[PDB]
């Protein structure tokens, strides 16, 4: 990904975009009861905590485009992976406007909270106005698609979330690039069926984990995986993707019966976007807040791994590659051991920064005892070994609970955390509930006891 040019929006007929200058995150009732070193991300150029220019910091994720064309290795990766998706019988038909808008089996209805995008964000028009759950009306949207068309600029927002002390001081705040409602709708109509297929089939056939339920999915993973596991982390995956990877993605889509609408991928790839008073054009790099982003990143990750395997290890049998990706996150396996370090260097050739899995200083053997996926460890149940617990470290949970966006969401926010926490064992969980109940707010909450969660989990398979 690389910025081609940037400049004042007024010079090209675009209006300035107001972005919430204040963070919605504030110390929660549990701020001093649990330990955390995280603070709200930097949102404006003026934040006193900065130690380097804010504008440069946020855009520096656009490293450039290391590759131009789609080489032989990528092509075979495309063939192999396209070959697998082919077996799912993915409905190639387009999805109707109604389903694309209000959900259907396999696809949730448009999220009514996230940005409406341009020009709606500049008109003052919000989502709850364009649609509604009960009546499932499309007349309004239909009228708006005809009015402002598609392929509209993305609106770039600084993501309001928790970041480490360093990330704050270096202004390393992440960006959400909001897709226009129209684009969102169109893309959903175009690939709705593809998304549904993916959500209903997390595993080694889609090579995707998007939409999965970790409580249940964990127990299936090891079975699906080959003998020797391998993994690594990416640095700025989304922004590092070169146009060539999008081309490969288009090739896959084309091979699975989506040829007629690969144009949407160009839009993700080579787009035009708005940030405050500035307008800029980007070549390469996957925009975060667009329709299919997770799925497309995952598909690309499938092509990436294959490509590196093919280039690093001629003769490799991809039919024996068992991987599951969730965007840039990935768990992979092969019957034979592979050198992650060696793969990381082949990666650098395709504009990919690959480092040891889970910030280890050096590349080491990945085992079931140390591997993580979606920040979660894998731990067989002490009583029912065949059932695997997804284990989110308590540190993450403590960090999260120390803050709040909406005091009314406290109940759900804590409840959610518990559903994650209990997998750390009864003793750990009780200490957690104990701490929660050491403040009035926490005592007022309605939380599940350990035995409840455990029994429900056991019964769920």
UniProtKB/Swiss-Prot annotation:
It catalyses: RNA(n) + a ribonucleoside 5'-triphosphate = RNA(n+1) + diphosphate. Replication or transcription is subject to high level of random mutations by the nucleotide analog ribavirin. Mg(2+) 1 binds at residues 233, 328. Residues 1-461 are cytoplasmic. Its cofactor is Mg(2+). Residues 227-342 form the RdRp catalytic domain. Binds 2 magnesium ions that constitute a dinuclear catalytic metal center. The magnesium ions are not prebound but only present for catalysis. Requires the presence of 3CDpro or 3CPro. It comes from the Viruses. It is a peripheral membrane protein. Mg(2+) 2 binds at residues 233, 328. It is found in: Host cytoplasmic vesicle membrane. Interacts with Viral protein genome-linked and with protein 3CD. Replicates the viral genomic RNA on the surface of intracellular membranes. May form linear arrays of subunits that propagate along a strong head-to-tail interaction called interface-I. Covalently attaches UMP to a tyrosine of VPg, which is used to prime RNA synthesis. The positive stranded RNA genome is first replicated at virus induced membranous vesicles, creating a dsRNA genomic replication form. This dsRNA is then used as template to synthesize positive stranded RNA genomes. ss(+)RNA genomes are either translated, replicated or encapsidated. This is RNA-directed RNA polymerase. It comes from Poliovirus type 1 (strain Mahoney). The lineage of its organism: Viruses, Riboviria, Orthornavirae, Pisuviricota, Pisoniviricetes. The chain holds residues 1749 to 2209 of 2209 of the full protein.
